Subunit: 254 residues, 4 copies
């Protein structure tokens, strides 16, 4: 039960976004939700998707996590509009498409740093600004993939950006733990989303889960959202620096 | 919300048992609970502890997990008495004082195999018997410690037993996943219980957690119970073969 | 260069044994070698295989690692025959055939404990006895598989015994470190040997390595042997409690 | 024996550099060595240091790894001057001093990306250029630290850069494995070097190893160099995407 909680959900682009499965679950559990987006198209999609939620007010903020001032001012505006928050769900990554197929060793410096900036560093600065709204403690969760732990074909520069994110989670957990802020990751199995369309071989990744993972099926956004509700709530009070795989068991097999 | 769910909880000895933390949480959430014990003194404690619970009926079965027949007959009786179950919490381990409190390289064969048998093999046979009561699926959770992942001073034979149990969890997850049974572990931080008396230097282990773990505090049995509630319920659909550290973040630091 | 070093190699059965790859390499580097075996037939193979090696004398001892007396008396006799040794290569495991295929949840208690006894505990008692012949320090290496780290189809009871071995390696490393004895594992990739005939689906495991592993080829016993020379020698003096995968990179991908 | 092998060693600053331990070992084993340095100081210094080696000639190239041109042109020139190479030792990392103490959550975007660029991406572009000089295969080794696997006090931005670097090794292993180029890391224990002075609390880190690591002592640059010789030679054929801890066993304990 999350009535009287407030969470900031970063990274809804459309009805297939992982962050939207999180939103549906939290919403259904009674939470107040604030949404951040980059592209105008994503705000338009949030406005339509909010008609499916039970949020009596639209709280939408444009935050491009490449910009310190947009992250700083965005959270400062959120604090002014809704007061203190209980957590942040971070569902944000980016890499140029030519870096999500072919040969990893041909990755450009600009593409490698782009992916690090948006997919990893953004959690650091978000945590720094979000903590200002969590004087009593809180919970920050980011979304990762098994390609941060193992080399997977095609995931290439984003695998190295997820390894960076997963370490970023541990270091933030150590730093913010004395402030009663927990920081954790969910390592989601493959899910058809707008960003999946850029990963080479994505359909064969999905098929392999169905054939080989312990549950012999793929997961969906709402399953990620249910684990998010656990990590964002008091149920997980003793848990920080942790990476929970929501992937039908695929992480545990070879 | 666990109304209309039934769970078997194995390994309450007294009010400090981790499994009683689990019981309290599941009870508060509306579950029907069934309890298994070894020593007659454990049954007496269970009888006194059930007064604190909302359980309208006492469902108590003696199962020494060294005996196949006791596990077989105990789960069969549980089925005839309460019907199908939704999961099992396994909170059982044992090792001799004499092997524990000597150099690891001095561990006796008998003591090594005793600790495997009770602390690891018991999950396998329990899973096999409990699956007969879970025709539509279920969840099985066992309780481990960071000593199964790293060599910790003094934990000695029980660290090898915990590594065995953590691998047992992954193999059971692979085997039983197509039956929609999930199998997971909770890696609890140190907690003062009857069995902790067995571990040398236990007080300095507690003190290290306070000084060094991200949350700068120790965890308690109810925190283990809240993560158990997540693992045993539909909130962790899609999570199997996982090991969730309820340990203030200690696993993530060095 | 291992002239003036002496190593005990445990677990040659025939010319395909992983331990015979280790023997050839160590022999080619000038080490003096002592061999232990269980079955008469293995002693006969060792007698034949020694004609290929540069050892000027056969040091052969029957040690069934299920027997404490055989391990104690065998190492005692080794020390009386060749003096102090520089390390031990352990290449011993066993499980009953029915436990290397089908459903893990059906594993018998006696089969689970049998595999633990031979494949894990044996290392502990061997280290205890071998330490008496290494008063200046030494190196002990055991042979594991990725199935001890992940659930692998069919490997079943041996995967849990290997997770146990791997923890045994870390706990021995911690215990024996102050005596200047290093203890490490090599995680070998699949290799056609007599014991491979017990693993269901073995040929499929081999084909997956050629298709998926970074080197796109399988490894052989001599490559294990070369990593064994590294771990048994001063070249690895800083390295203990480690598990080195000699598996064409397969451990690193998913 | 590395006679008739040529290795490029990147990252000698002075007599305490880890890469100078590597050079000593490879030089002694008969390898021809080429050296790269960033700033002038490291030149002058290199010129002097190399009188301690048996290199008949001084092959020194200025390469600042922030510059694509310098990496591309530097490897090109090494190929013209010396011909094909057998491997590359990468011993290069950098972060701003302020980012190696205090609160990780305060790290600037500029500081985080600088550490990623120099300490992780540099391996990718180095590997791409160096491949051109390894048409029959070779071996690339980078130097990492346990702070890339766990959150360590103070190490902060560099911990996230080393996590990135360790994933970089695996993705390069997968990519370059079919060209018979292996890529691996050495995770060195703490060692007093010029870069160590920047790391907050370094002396406390060192003391902890002596007190708690299995070998109860610290490691040195030459021990890193001996494991580098293993990784760079045919002894480690079959080993790729691996991270070998030369740290007195500290990684294996908690
Ligand atoms: N789909 C999967 O199988 C899978 C599996 C594991 C993990 N993940 C992770 O889950 C997360 C969500 O991805 P998704 O699959 O749900 O795809 P998605 O719907 O495309 O979500 C990606 C989000 O990233 C945002 N974003 C990119 N750059 C940004 C920037 N500079 N500033 C602020 N927002 C930015 C996008 O916003 P705009 O569209 O407004 O630009 C979009 O809302 C990502 O971290 C992804 O790596 C996905
Ligand atoms: N305390 C901690 O710091 C800690 C941390 C991580 C993990 N754990 C784990 O948590 C679990 C519970 O331990 P605890 O600390 O709660 O100690 P506990 O209160 O002493 O519970 C241990 C239980 O194991 C049972 N048991 C032992 N052998 C048995 C057998 N042959 N058949 C049936 N039951 C048997 C005992 O039953 P009887 O008394 O009836 O014999 C007792 O109920 C164990 O797996 C333990 O390793 C403990
Ligand atoms: N082949 C692979 O793909 C692979 C991969 C990774 C790891 N491994 C491991 O490598 C090691 C060697 O196996 P292998 O593949 O080389 O097969 P192998 O040639 O069949 O060697 C197995 C050895 O185990 C010995 N052994 C079994 N029980 C024993 C006992 N009670 N006491 C003394 N020795 C006993 C056997 O001796 P007797 O025949 O005399 O009984 C035999 O010499 C094992 O630990 C295995 O798990 C194998
Ligand atoms: N010492 C330790 O305890 C320890 C432990 C684990 C891992 N490591 C790692 O070992 C490696 C070597 O460090 P070290 O401790 O040997 O210290 P070091 O002697 O200071 O070596 C660091 C080297 O990095 C070079 N470097 C920095 N930025 C560069 C750039 N942009 N282009 C080219 N070179 C650049 C420096 O060259 P200039 O001096 O010319 O600036 C210096 O030679 C690093 O990867 C470090 O993280 C060190
Ligand atoms: C293979 C599974 C997967 C993982 C992801 O991280 C993912 O999301 C991204 C992948 C690449 C770039 N930006 C993203 F958001 C999509 C995906 F489909
Ligand atoms: C150090 C933390 C800890 C872990 C345990 O597994 C634990 O439980 C046991 C420890 C040893 C033997 N039987 C047990 F049940 C107690 C403990 F105190
Ligand atoms: C699949 C790879 C593999 C691993 C082994 O541990 C192995 O060796 C055994 C496998 C099962 C039982 N005893 C053994 F010695 C054979 C093998 F082929
Ligand atoms: C704590 C151990 C350690 C690790 C390092 O990576 C290290 O080297 C650097 C540390 C930080 C920045 N640049 C470096 F080269 C020094 C160090 F002393
Ligand atoms: N190479 C295709 C992969 C097709 C698939 O999803 O399997 C792509 O670039 O998406
Ligand atoms: N070895 C002591 C432990 C002392 C402590 O708790 O620190 C014991 O017998 O329990
Ligand atoms: N020689 C193979 C025969 C494979 C087959 O034809 O069954 C064996 O050892 O089983
Ligand atoms: N079921 C066969 C598998 C055939 C193979 O792939 O080796 C076995 O038991 O060996």
């Amino acid at each position: 039960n999350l009535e009287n909680k407030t969470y900031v959900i970063m990274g809804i682009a459309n009805k297939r976004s992982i962050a939207f499965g999180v939103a549906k679950v939290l919403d259904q559990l009674g939470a107040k939700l604030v949404f951040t987006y980059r592209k105008e198209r994503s705000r338009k999609e949030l406005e339509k998707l909010l008609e499916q939620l039970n949020q009596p007010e639209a709280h939408l903020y444009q935050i491009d996590v490449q910009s310190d001032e947009e992250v700083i001012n965005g959270f400062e505006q959120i604090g002014k509009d809704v007061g203190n928050i209980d957590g942040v769900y971070h569902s944000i990554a980016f890499a140029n498409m030519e870096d999500l197929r072919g040969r990893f060793s041909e990755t450009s410096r600009e593409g490698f740093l782009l992916a690090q900036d948006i997919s990893s560093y953004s959690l650091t600065i978000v945590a720094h600004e979000a903590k200002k709204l969590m004087p009593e403690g809180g919970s920050i969760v980011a979304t990762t993939y098994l390609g941060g732990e193992f080399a997977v074909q095609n995931y290439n520069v984003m695998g190295v950006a997820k390894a960076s994110l997963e370490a970023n989670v541990k270091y933030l957990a150590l730093d913010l733990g004395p402030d009663n802020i927990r920081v954790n990751a969910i390592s989601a199995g493959p899910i058809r989303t707008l960003s999946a369309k850029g990963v080479g071989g994505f359909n064969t990744i999905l098929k392999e889960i169905e054939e080989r993972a312990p549950l012999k099926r793929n997961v969906d956004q709402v399953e990620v959202g249910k684990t998010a509700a656990y990590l964002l709530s008091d149920l997980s009070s003793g848990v920080t620096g942790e990476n929970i795989h929501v992937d039908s068991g695929f992480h545990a097999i070879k």
